């Protein structure tokens, strides 16, 4: 009947979060209404940043060999992401349900208590905790935790119940998709017909009219409908209730962004909520999940709507495609768009300074220490802070030592770095558990103890 | 009853063309149905390239002091054109009718025979000439010329009569504009209301609903309606019949492009048609007006429709504005868009080579010769070819001399040039009468006699 945190939903947000919470030592119970995984695999593949956030927790061997691609697009306009370092890491084909499967197995292995066939019906936040009414296999009962995170999808029960505001615009049309056998081991169709208002046969009629080709004879594996409703909560947290994934942001599924943003909500949240449970941090840390991820979510609605207009509008939008195509020929444009599609652009407010990596993801950096060959990616496996002492400076090691219960201080000779990476001439980096750079030397206005304090809390009492 | 060329229309296309034809020594008769200039001034200002094509004919003193601005925009998104060299030359406020007035006076001074209150009713092209039925002050009569150029506006009588194909898309909505006194020497309004189907009072109703402010009490100077019909002729010439201006391309009036493109159609055409009349060139030269200017016209429909979508669509297009705004922060994007709005981007196919100016406009270049201080702009005043011998190379002077009846060969020490201008390390430039670079050394694949031949025709018989 207890846990430190209750997570509602075992989609990719919920499973990632459960795992992250376990890495922070948190007792976590996940509540999922479905008895089994649906096996749909509506999304295909994942972004280079998602691949990186899997990698930094050692999750990748679970997938085996993964096909990658630099061939991306923005609203249908094709171009090469190769122009942006690290964009090569995008997984091309993995179905959503395989990804979910691995994250479930990962999080379960770490000790997450996942209760399937348990539906959350209602909830009460009373300042000291959250209590949920749940229907399980045994019928109605209650559970209680310090915190409750709604990872329960587009039509979130938690969002509805805790009184979150969810402004934005209602659905305007309807698309269709189908898993089908016959003509071209089943191939997918993408049915986006002109002017469909908000049986599988109608899905055929929508294909014969759009392309001229007849397919009313195909075996229907999966058939589904979806909108272009675009909404985001004004608050990611109301007291002891938190949201991550679709529960916080819905949009047209354009340019492969939803699962990726939701998994990455969970990666921002886990370590922060864990610090809070463990008592090493205050709710100030917790607020940075709202500000950081509301900002990201806002950008996701922009991204997907902008692509949707380019994809779904008639020939009237062609002059815009044409202009944008011309712009895409410029390196800076290509990279900007690749930055946005990949998620590699993501930059949190961590204070000012000239260091080009502040607030951005720490890119993969090879490291030789005194006792081992390792990498920044490797050192992130346990979801602790990582301070890289790149120029054998022992003063640095002593300034940070009061946070060494929470931050690994690593002295290493760094590998070769690219001009564009941001790592040239860098003598030190403080990396947050989610991989984001809190501070670097030289070129941070804020000092190292401020950064350590801001993300990890009070120093140890000597 | 005769002339070498008959021009139909004394809008800015017709007046510029008349002038250009006079500079080539051509007997030109302009036929204009209106008795006086309407005085509307629907367009305000003109582009930096228009300013340059006026400048290169010494037309500018007619305007006196002209206010210029680097503050431009693309579909409402404001930014600084200063990033592109020469974009500063955009005239900010001059009304269309002042500009027309000066071009009329300029062309009349050069000997253009302009017949006002003469309307073209019909025409016949019979392989050796064109004959028009015209109603004048004396009633119906006929005129004949070697060529006929329709510069007769959006609803072109010439285009209709000579059987030009005019594909594209019909008008979709309707806007309004008004010259008005009262609140804020009369100020203009811009009325673009949501969902108006294809009296001045309705123009007031369209202002009170759009802004919330009431103005049903204002004195109506000028009041007009216009569409977003977007069409372009597939042929700029059918035999001995030619089109320039709106007669060839109609579009939404977005981002100040129409008059500018039409004046510039006339600048491309005049010298070519003149060479043809004078017998120094063949109809091959004349075809390059079609190819060069159809291409430009096609780009104009793209430009204006793309801006219109950004201007006139609801909030649904805001994510696109936002993305585009972000892109505009990049120099290359800013310049590209400035290139397109200013017209400075315009580049004709003149053959290949590495020289960065091939086919582009020759930028203003100061020149010291043996007998005078001058400029490339100055040398273009008489609409002849100009070959700049920038490194005292007498072999060059002799290779071109067989075209010196048609091409001024000028030996000069060039002034300081910018890195981005395209003139660094350039030893020679062949400039066409419209200001476009046909050939330059080093870095042209084609040789100088080929270029001379292609634009000026047969060499002189020694
Ligand atoms: C056609 C289509 C294509 C897509 N393609 C892509 C793509 O290419 N790339 C991409 O990144 N994203 C894509 N998405 C979005 C993606 O599918 C993600 O699942 C979604 O964006 C985020 O998942 P989530 O974990 O937050 O929520 P969900 O995946 O919706 O999971 C929420 C879970 O909560 C459970 N639940 C709900 N209510 C309760 C309750 N009261 N009690 C207990 N449990 C509950 C549900 O059963 C569900 O399993 C696509 C979506 C669609 C429709
Ligand atoms: C509201 C508005 C704002 C605009 N703003 C701008 C702007 O900011 N910048 C810009 O560059 N452009 C702008 N334009 C376009 C611009 O007004 C130009 O005049 C047009 O783009 C090109 O002019 P033209 O000489 O080809 O034809 P026109 O100006 O239409 O002149 C054609 C002439 O032919 C005459 N004619 C027609 N039929 C016959 C016949 N049978 N016989 C004899 N004569 C005939 C007509 O009387 C007319 O004078 C705007 C247009 C509108 C409506
Ligand atoms: Cl998506
Ligand atoms: Cl090792
Ligand atoms: Cl225009
Ligand atoms: Cl002089």
Short mmCIF file of N, CA and C in Angstrom, two decimals, chain A residues 131-213:
data_model
loop_
_atom_site.label_atom_id
_atom_site.label_comp_id
_atom_site.label_asym_id
_atom_site.label_seq_id
_atom_site.Cartn_x
_atom_site.Cartn_y
_atom_site.Cartn_z
N UNK A 131 -2.88 9.97 -2.38
CA UNK A 131 -3.58 8.71 -2.18
C UNK A 131 -4.41 8.43 -3.41
N UNK A 132 -4.29 7.23 -3.96
CA UNK A 132 -5.05 6.88 -5.17
C UNK A 132 -6.02 5.73 -4.95
N UNK A 133 -7.21 5.87 -5.52
CA UNK A 133 -8.11 4.75 -5.65
C UNK A 133 -7.76 4.01 -6.93
N UNK A 134 -7.52 2.71 -6.77
CA UNK A 134 -7.08 1.84 -7.84
C UNK A 134 -7.99 0.62 -7.91
N UNK A 135 -8.45 0.29 -9.11
CA UNK A 135 -9.10 -0.99 -9.33
C UNK A 135 -8.06 -1.96 -9.86
N UNK A 136 -7.82 -3.03 -9.10
CA UNK A 136 -6.93 -4.09 -9.55
C UNK A 136 -7.68 -5.38 -9.82
N UNK A 137 -6.95 -6.49 -9.99
CA UNK A 137 -7.55 -7.83 -10.09
C UNK A 137 -8.41 -8.20 -8.87
N UNK A 138 -8.12 -7.61 -7.71
CA UNK A 138 -8.86 -7.82 -6.47
C UNK A 138 -9.97 -6.77 -6.26
N UNK A 139 -10.21 -5.94 -7.27
CA UNK A 139 -11.14 -4.82 -7.13
C UNK A 139 -10.53 -3.59 -6.47
N UNK A 140 -11.40 -2.71 -5.97
CA UNK A 140 -11.03 -1.38 -5.46
C UNK A 140 -10.20 -1.39 -4.17
N UNK A 141 -9.07 -0.67 -4.19
CA UNK A 141 -8.22 -0.43 -3.02
C UNK A 141 -7.48 0.89 -3.15
N UNK A 142 -6.80 1.31 -2.09
CA UNK A 142 -6.07 2.58 -2.11
C UNK A 142 -4.57 2.38 -1.94
N UNK A 143 -3.78 3.28 -2.54
CA UNK A 143 -2.33 3.30 -2.36
C UNK A 143 -1.88 4.72 -2.04
N UNK A 144 -0.75 4.83 -1.35
CA UNK A 144 -0.24 6.14 -0.95
C UNK A 144 1.28 6.26 -1.15
N UNK A 145 1.72 7.43 -1.63
CA UNK A 145 3.15 7.72 -1.78
C UNK A 145 3.45 9.17 -1.47
N UNK A 146 4.73 9.49 -1.30
CA UNK A 146 5.13 10.87 -1.15
C UNK A 146 4.71 11.66 -2.39
N UNK A 147 4.98 11.08 -3.56
CA UNK A 147 4.67 11.72 -4.84
C UNK A 147 3.93 10.80 -5.80
N UNK A 148 3.20 11.41 -6.73
CA UNK A 148 2.50 10.69 -7.79
C UNK A 148 2.83 11.34 -9.14
N UNK A 149 3.32 10.54 -10.09
CA UNK A 149 3.64 11.03 -11.43
C UNK A 149 2.68 10.38 -12.42
N UNK A 150 1.90 11.21 -13.09
CA UNK A 150 1.03 10.76 -14.16
C UNK A 150 1.82 10.62 -15.45
N UNK A 151 2.09 9.37 -15.84
CA UNK A 151 2.66 9.02 -17.14
C UNK A 151 1.61 8.24 -17.93
N UNK A 152 0.36 8.67 -17.79
CA UNK A 152 -0.79 7.93 -18.29
C UNK A 152 -1.39 8.42 -19.62
N UNK A 153 -0.56 9.01 -20.48
CA UNK A 153 -0.91 9.21 -21.90
C UNK A 153 -1.71 10.44 -22.24
N UNK A 154 -2.15 10.51 -23.49
CA UNK A 154 -2.86 11.68 -24.02
C UNK A 154 -4.09 12.10 -23.25
N UNK A 155 -4.88 11.11 -22.84
CA UNK A 155 -6.16 11.31 -22.14
C UNK A 155 -6.00 11.14 -20.63
N UNK A 156 -4.82 11.51 -20.13
CA UNK A 156 -4.42 11.39 -18.71
C UNK A 156 -5.52 11.52 -17.65
N UNK A 157 -5.68 10.46 -16.85
CA UNK A 157 -6.61 10.48 -15.73
C UNK A 157 -6.09 11.37 -14.60
N UNK A 158 -4.77 11.41 -14.46
CA UNK A 158 -4.11 12.17 -13.39
C UNK A 158 -4.20 13.66 -13.64
N UNK A 159 -4.01 14.05 -14.89
CA UNK A 159 -4.08 15.43 -15.30
C UNK A 159 -5.48 15.97 -15.05
N UNK A 160 -6.48 15.17 -15.42
CA UNK A 160 -7.89 15.53 -15.25
C UNK A 160 -8.25 15.70 -13.77
N UNK A 161 -7.74 14.78 -12.94
CA UNK A 161 -8.13 14.69 -11.54
C UNK A 161 -7.44 15.70 -10.62
N UNK A 162 -6.21 16.08 -10.94
CA UNK A 162 -5.47 16.99 -10.08
C UNK A 162 -5.70 18.45 -10.46
N UNK A 163 -6.60 18.67 -11.42
CA UNK A 163 -6.95 20.00 -11.87
C UNK A 163 -5.85 20.77 -12.59
N UNK A 164 -5.17 20.11 -13.54
CA UNK A 164 -4.20 20.78 -14.40
C UNK A 164 -4.93 21.58 -15.48
N UNK A 165 -4.43 22.78 -15.78
CA UNK A 165 -4.94 23.53 -16.94
C UNK A 165 -4.26 22.98 -18.19
N UNK A 166 -5.04 22.83 -19.25
CA UNK A 166 -4.55 22.17 -20.45
C UNK A 166 -4.98 22.95 -21.68
N UNK A 167 -4.51 24.21 -21.82
CA UNK A 167 -4.92 25.08 -22.94
C UNK A 167 -4.27 24.66 -24.27
N UNK A 168 -4.70 25.28 -25.36
CA UNK A 168 -4.30 24.90 -26.71
C UNK A 168 -5.52 24.81 -27.62
N UNK A 169 -5.38 24.09 -28.73
CA UNK A 169 -6.44 24.07 -29.73
C UNK A 169 -6.94 22.65 -30.02
N UNK A 170 -8.26 22.54 -30.17
CA UNK A 170 -8.93 21.26 -30.40
C UNK A 170 -8.55 20.66 -31.75
N UNK A 171 -8.78 19.36 -31.89
CA UNK A 171 -8.52 18.64 -33.14
C UNK A 171 -9.29 19.27 -34.31
N UNK A 172 -8.67 19.27 -35.49
CA UNK A 172 -9.21 19.96 -36.66
C UNK A 172 -9.55 18.96 -37.78
N UNK A 173 -8.82 17.84 -37.83
CA UNK A 173 -9.08 16.77 -38.82
C UNK A 173 -8.77 15.38 -38.26
N UNK A 174 -8.79 14.36 -39.12
CA UNK A 174 -8.45 13.01 -38.70
C UNK A 174 -7.68 12.24 -39.76
N UNK A 175 -6.59 11.60 -39.34
CA UNK A 175 -5.83 10.72 -40.22
C UNK A 175 -6.09 9.25 -39.89
N UNK A 176 -5.46 8.37 -40.65
CA UNK A 176 -5.55 6.93 -40.42
C UNK A 176 -4.23 6.25 -40.72
N UNK A 177 -3.97 5.14 -40.04
CA UNK A 177 -2.85 4.27 -40.38
C UNK A 177 -3.22 2.80 -40.24
N UNK A 178 -2.55 1.96 -41.02
CA UNK A 178 -2.84 0.53 -41.02
C UNK A 178 -1.60 -0.34 -41.25
N UNK A 179 -1.48 -1.40 -40.45
CA UNK A 179 -0.53 -2.48 -40.71
C UNK A 179 -1.21 -3.49 -41.64
N UNK A 180 -0.62 -3.73 -42.81
CA UNK A 180 -1.28 -4.52 -43.86
C UNK A 180 -0.38 -5.51 -44.61
N UNK A 181 -0.95 -6.65 -44.98
CA UNK A 181 -0.26 -7.66 -45.80
C UNK A 181 -0.80 -7.67 -47.24
N UNK A 182 -0.08 -8.34 -48.15
CA UNK A 182 -0.54 -8.51 -49.53
C UNK A 182 0.39 -7.94 -50.59
N UNK A 183 0.16 -6.68 -50.96
CA UNK A 183 1.04 -5.92 -51.86
C UNK A 183 2.02 -5.11 -51.02
N UNK A 184 2.94 -4.40 -51.68
CA UNK A 184 3.97 -3.61 -50.97
C UNK A 184 4.23 -2.24 -51.60
N UNK A 185 6.38 -9.96 -41.62
CA UNK A 185 6.65 -9.19 -42.83
C UNK A 185 5.42 -8.47 -43.38
N UNK A 186 4.96 -7.45 -42.65
CA UNK A 186 3.82 -6.64 -43.07
C UNK A 186 4.24 -5.17 -43.24
N UNK A 187 3.77 -4.55 -44.32
CA UNK A 187 4.13 -3.17 -44.65
C UNK A 187 3.09 -2.20 -44.10
N UNK A 188 3.55 -1.02 -43.70
CA UNK A 188 2.65 0.01 -43.17
C UNK A 188 2.19 1.02 -44.24
N UNK A 189 0.96 1.51 -44.10
CA UNK A 189 0.42 2.58 -44.94
C UNK A 189 0.30 3.87 -44.12
N UNK A 190 0.31 5.01 -44.82
CA UNK A 190 0.15 6.33 -44.19
C UNK A 190 -0.94 7.13 -44.91
N UNK A 191 -2.14 7.14 -44.32
CA UNK A 191 -3.34 7.68 -44.98
C UNK A 191 -3.72 9.07 -44.48
N UNK A 192 -3.39 10.09 -45.28
CA UNK A 192 -3.61 11.51 -44.93
C UNK A 192 -4.35 12.29 -46.01
N UNK A 193 -5.66 12.03 -46.11
CA UNK A 193 -6.53 12.54 -47.18
C UNK A 193 -7.06 13.95 -46.93
N UNK A 194 -7.24 14.70 -48.01
CA UNK A 194 -7.75 16.07 -47.99
C UNK A 194 -9.18 16.21 -47.43
N UNK A 195 -9.30 16.80 -46.24
CA UNK A 195 -10.60 17.24 -45.70
C UNK A 195 -11.48 16.24 -44.95
N UNK A 196 -10.83 15.27 -44.31
CA UNK A 196 -11.51 14.27 -43.48
C UNK A 196 -11.94 14.91 -42.14
N UNK A 197 -13.26 14.92 -41.84
CA UNK A 197 -13.82 15.48 -40.60
C UNK A 197 -13.26 14.84 -39.32
N UNK A 198 -13.33 15.56 -38.17
CA UNK A 198 -12.73 15.11 -36.91
C UNK A 198 -13.33 13.80 -36.37
N UNK A 199 -14.91 1.30 -39.85
CA UNK A 199 -14.45 0.13 -40.60
C UNK A 199 -13.16 0.43 -41.36
N UNK A 200 -12.43 -0.64 -41.67
CA UNK A 200 -11.21 -0.55 -42.46
C UNK A 200 -11.47 -0.14 -43.90
N UNK A 201 -12.68 -0.41 -44.39
CA UNK A 201 -13.06 -0.11 -45.78
C UNK A 201 -12.90 1.34 -46.14
N UNK A 202 -13.29 2.23 -45.22
CA UNK A 202 -13.12 3.67 -45.41
C UNK A 202 -11.63 4.06 -45.50
N UNK A 203 -10.78 3.30 -44.80
CA UNK A 203 -9.32 3.44 -44.90
C UNK A 203 -8.79 3.07 -46.30
N UNK A 204 -9.48 2.16 -46.98
CA UNK A 204 -9.15 1.79 -48.37
C UNK A 204 -9.57 2.91 -49.33
N UNK A 205 -10.79 3.42 -49.14
CA UNK A 205 -11.33 4.53 -49.93
C UNK A 205 -10.45 5.75 -49.87
N UNK A 206 -9.77 5.91 -48.73
CA UNK A 206 -8.83 7.01 -48.50
C UNK A 206 -7.47 6.78 -49.17
N UNK A 207 -7.21 5.55 -49.59
CA UNK A 207 -5.98 5.23 -50.30
C UNK A 207 -6.16 5.25 -51.79
N UNK A 208 -7.30 4.76 -52.28
CA UNK A 208 -7.60 4.77 -53.72
C UNK A 208 -7.79 6.19 -54.27
N UNK A 209 -8.31 7.09 -53.43
CA UNK A 209 -8.49 8.49 -53.83
C UNK A 209 -7.18 9.30 -53.79
N UNK A 210 -6.35 9.08 -52.77
CA UNK A 210 -5.07 9.80 -52.62
C UNK A 210 -4.00 9.44 -53.66
N UNK A 211 -3.88 8.16 -54.02
CA UNK A 211 -2.79 7.68 -54.90
C UNK A 211 -3.26 7.16 -56.25
N UNK A 212 -4.53 6.77 -56.34
CA UNK A 212 -5.07 6.18 -57.55
C UNK A 212 -4.99 4.66 -57.56
N UNK A 213 -4.27 4.10 -56.59
CA UNK A 213 -4.06 2.65 -56.50
C UNK A 213 -5.07 1.97 -55.57
#
